[PDB]
Amino acid sequence: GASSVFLFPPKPKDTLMISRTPEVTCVVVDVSQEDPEVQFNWYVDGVEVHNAKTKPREEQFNSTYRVVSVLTVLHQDWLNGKEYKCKVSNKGLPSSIEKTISKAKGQPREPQVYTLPPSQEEMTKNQVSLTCLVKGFYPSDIAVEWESNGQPENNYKTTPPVLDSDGSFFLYSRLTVDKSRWQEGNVFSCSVMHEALHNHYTQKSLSLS
Amino acid sequence: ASSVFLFPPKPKDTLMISRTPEVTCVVVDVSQEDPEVQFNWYVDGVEVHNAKTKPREEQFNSTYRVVSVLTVLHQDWLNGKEYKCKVSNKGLPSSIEKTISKAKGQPREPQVYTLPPSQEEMTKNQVSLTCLVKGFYPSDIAVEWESNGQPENNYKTTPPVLDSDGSFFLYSRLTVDKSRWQEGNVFSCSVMHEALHNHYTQKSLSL
Numbered sequence: 001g002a003s004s005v006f007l008f009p010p011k012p013k014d015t016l017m018i019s020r021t022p023e024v025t026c027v028v029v030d031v032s033q034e035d036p037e038v039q040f041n042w043y044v045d046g047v048e049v050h051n052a053k054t055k056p057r058e059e060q061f062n063s064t065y066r067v068v069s070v071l072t073v074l075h076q077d078w079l080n081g082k083e084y085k086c087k088v089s090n091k092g093l094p095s096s097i098e099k100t101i102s103k104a105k106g107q108p109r110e111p112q113v114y115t116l117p118p119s120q121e122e123m124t125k126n127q128v129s130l131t132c133l134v135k136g137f138y139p140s141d142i143a144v145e146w147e148s149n150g151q152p153e154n155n156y157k158t159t160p161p162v163l164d165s166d167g168s169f170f171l172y173s174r175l176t177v178d179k180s181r182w183q184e185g186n187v188f189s190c191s192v193m194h195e196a197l198h199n200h201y202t203q204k205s206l207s208l209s
Numbered sequence: 210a211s212s213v214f215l216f217p218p219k220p221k222d223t224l225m226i227s228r229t230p231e232v233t234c235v236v237v238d239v240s241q242e243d244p245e246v247q248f249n250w251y252v253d254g255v256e257v258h259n260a261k262t263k264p265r266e267e268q269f270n271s272t273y274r275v276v277s278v279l280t281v282l283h284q285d286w287l288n289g290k291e292y293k294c295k296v297s298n299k300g301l302p303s304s305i306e307k308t309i310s311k312a313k314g315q316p317r318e319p320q321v322y323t324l325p326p327s328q329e330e331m332t333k334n335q336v337s338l339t340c341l342v343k344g345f346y347p348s349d350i351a352v353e354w355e356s357n358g359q360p361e362n363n364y365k366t367t368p369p370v371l372d373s374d375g376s377f378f379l380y381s382r383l384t385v386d387k388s389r390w391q392e393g394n395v396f397s398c399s400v401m402h403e404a405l406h407n408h409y410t411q412k413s414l415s416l
C-alpha cells in the first residue's frame with residue numbers, strides 16, 4: 001500500500017532561522033482497524049535517527065485511521081541537501097513502505113524583490129493594493145510577509161511560485177490597505193526569506209511618493 | 210479509478226457566442242489487451258449522446274489513452290449544470306464516474322489594474338509590466354497581453370489564488386525590453402470573464 005504514505009518537507013521559513021523548528025512529516029492514511037500498530041524508522045542520509053515523535057492513530061470521517069510521525073531536522077542538514085527517509089511498517093509484520101525527500105537540487109539563485117505602488121486607477125477606491133514582485137529565485141522554497149510601523153500587516157495574500165522560462169521562479173504578494181493609511185504617508189515593507197539571500201532575509205519598503 | 214480525468218471548457222469558449230465550449234473526458238493507463246473503452250455522458254443526470262470519442266493512442270510508457278469530447282451549451286455551463294462522464298469497458302461490469310460543473314456562487318466582477326515596472330527594475334535590459342486582476346468569481350478567467358493592436362507573447366500568469374473574502378485574484382507579468390517601454394509604446398492587458406460587460410475588458414499601460 002505505497003500510495004498511502006506521504007512525506008512532507010519543512011516550511012521554508014522554519015529552515016531559514018535556527019531558532020525555529022523545521023520538521024519533516026510522514027503521514028500514513030487508510031490505516032485499518034484490523035491493522036497492527038503502525039511503526040516508523042527514520043533515516044538521514046541512510047543513518048537511522050531516533051528523535052521522531054509519532055502520534056496515536058486518529059480516526060477520519062471515512063472509516064479509516066491516519067497516523068503521523070514528525071521528525072525535527074537540523075536546518076543546515078536540510079539546506080545542505082541531506083535525504084530524509086521514512087520507513088513505514090506494521091508491528092509484527094515484515095514488509096514496509098519507504099519514502100524519501102530532500103530539498104530541490106540546482107544552484108540556488110537569489111530573488112530580486114520589487115515593490116509596486118497602487119495603480120493610479122485604483123486610487124479611486126476605499127482600499128488600495130501594494131504589490132511585491134519577487135523574481136529570479138531558486139529553489140521555489142520561499143516566505144514573504146509584510147509589515148508597517150514594526151507590526152505585521154496581515155491583510156495580504158501571496159501567489160504560489162510560478163516557473164519562469166530561465167528555470168527560476170517568481171511570485172507576487174498583494175497587501176490590501178485602507179487608502180487613508182497609504183495617503184497618510186505610512187511606510188509599508190515586504191520581507192522576503194530565502195536561502196540565497198544574505199542572512200536569509202531582505203526587505204523593501206514602499207510609501208506614497 | 211485515478212485513471213480518468215474530466216476537464217472544464219476553456220474560459221474563452223464559454224464566454225464568446227462565436228466559440229463552442231466543450232467538456233473533455235480523458236482515460237489513461239489503458240492496457241493493450243483491454244476491451245473497448247466506452248463513455249456515457251450525462252447533463253444534470255440526463256443521458257446525452259452527442260459526444261465524439263477518439264480511438265486509443267499509445268504513450269511513451271507503452272500504455273494507451275482515450276479521449277471523449279462533449280460539446281456544451283454556453284448557458285448550460287454558465288448556469289451551473291453538472292456534466293458527468295461514465296467510463297467503462299465493453300463486456301465488463303465496473304464503471305468509473307467523474308463530474309464537473311462551474312463553481313456555484315454569485316459571480317463577481319474582476320477589477321483590472323496595470324502597474325509599470327519598479328524604478329529599481331529600470332536598471333535592467335528587460336522590465337516587468339504587471340496586470341493585477343482581483344475580486345473575481347468564479348475563478349474561470351482568461352488574461353492576455355497586446356501592444357499596438359498586436360498579441361505579445363512574453364508573459365506568464367499566476368494561477369488564481371483564493372482571497373480572504375472568497376473571491377480570486379491573480380497577476381500576469383509581461384516582460385519587455387527596456388527600450389520598448391522607454392520608447393513610449395502602449396501595452397494592454399485584456400481579461401475575459403463572465404461578470405464583465407461584453408465579457409471583456411482591456412486596460413492600457415505606458416510610460
Ligand SMILES: *[C@@H]1O[C@H](CO[C@@H]2O[C@@H](C)[C@@H](O)[C@@H](O)[C@@H]2O)[C@@H](O[C@@H]2O[C@H](CO)[C@@H](O[C@@H]3O[C@H](CO[C@H]4O[C@H](CO)[C@@H](O)[C@H](O)[C@@H]4O[C@@H]4O[C@H](CO)[C@@H](O[C@@H]5O[C@H](CO)[C@H](O)[C@H](O)[C@H]5O)[C@H](O)[C@H]4NC(C)=O)[C@@H](O)[C@H](O[C@H]4O[C@H](CO)[C@@H](O)[C@H](O)[C@@H]4O[C@@H]4O[C@H](CO)[C@@H](O)[C@H](O)[C@H]4NC(C)=O)[C@@H]3O)[C@H](O)[C@H]2NC(C)=O)[C@H](O)[C@H]1NC(C)=O
Nearest residue numbers: 008009010011022023024025027029030060061062064066
Ligand atoms: C480518508 O480520509 C483521509 C483524510 O482526509 C480527510 O478526511 C476525509 C474524511 C475528508 O474530509 C478529506 O477531505 C480530509 O482531508 C484521506 O487522506 C488523504 O489521502 C490522500 C490520498 O488518497 C492524500 O493525498 C495527497 O495529498 C497531498 C497533499 O497533501 C497536503 O495537502 C492537502 C490539501 O491540499 C491536505 O489535506 C493534506 O493534509 C496535506 O496537507 C499538508 O500536510 C503536511 C503534513 O501535515 C503539512 O506539512 C507540515 O505542516 C506542519 C504545520 O502544520 C509543519 O510546518 C511541518 O514542518 C510540515 O511538514 C502541509 O503544510 C499541509 N499542506 C496543506 C496545504 O495543508 C498530495 O501531495 C499528494 O499528491 C501526490 O500523490 C498523488 C497520488 O495520490 C499524485 O496524484 C500527486 O501528483 C502527488 O504526487 C507527488 O508529486 C510529487 C511532485 O509533483 C512527487 O515528488 C511525489 O513523489 C508524488 N507522489 C506520489 C506520486 O505518490 C496526494 O494527493 C491526502 O493528503 C490525505 N489527507 C490527509 C489529511 O492526510 C483518505 O484518502 C481517505 N480515504 C478514502 C477516501 O478512502
Ligand SMILES: *[C@@H]1O[C@H](CO[C@@H]2O[C@@H](C)[C@@H](O)[C@@H](O)[C@@H]2O)[C@@H](O[C@@H]2O[C@H](CO)[C@@H](O[C@@H]3O[C@H](CO[C@H]4O[C@H](CO)[C@@H](O)[C@H](O)[C@@H]4O[C@@H]4O[C@H](CO)[C@@H](O[C@@H]5O[C@H](CO)[C@H](O)[C@H](O)[C@H]5O)[C@H](O)[C@H]4NC(C)=O)[C@@H](O)[C@H](O[C@H]4O[C@H](CO)[C@@H](O)[C@H](O)[C@@H]4O[C@@H]4O[C@H](CO)[C@@H](O)[C@H](O)[C@H]4NC(C)=O)[C@@H]3O)[C@H](O)[C@H]2NC(C)=O)[C@H](O)[C@H]1NC(C)=O
Nearest residue numbers: 211214216217218219230231232233237238268269270272
Ligand atoms: C503513461 O503516459 C501517460 C501520458 O503522459 C505523457 O507521457 C508520459 C511518458 C510522461 O512523459 C508525461 O509527462 C506525458 O505527459 C500518463 O498520463 C498522465 O497520467 C497522469 C496521472 O498519473 C495525469 O495527471 C493528471 O493531470 C491532470 C491535469 O492534466 C492536464 O494538464 C497536464 C499538464 O501537466 C497535461 O499533461 C494533461 O494533458 C492535461 O492537460 C489538459 O488536457 C485537457 C484535455 O486534453 C485540456 O482541456 C481541453 O483542451 C482542449 C484543447 O485542445 C479544448 O480547449 C477543450 O475544450 C478542453 O476541455 C486542458 O487544457 C489541458 N490542460 C493544460 C494545462 O494544458 C491533473 O488535474 C490531475 O491531478 C488531479 O488528480 C490527481 C489524481 O486523481 C490528484 O492527485 C490531484 O491532486 C488532482 O486532483 C484533482 O484536483 C482538481 C483540482 O485541483 C479537482 O477538481 C479534482 O476533483 C481532483 N481529482 C481527484 C481528487 O480525484 C492528474 O495529476 C496526466 O494528465 C496524464 N497525461 C496525459 C497527457 O493524459 C500516464 O500516467 C503514464 N503512466 C504511467 C507513468 O504509469
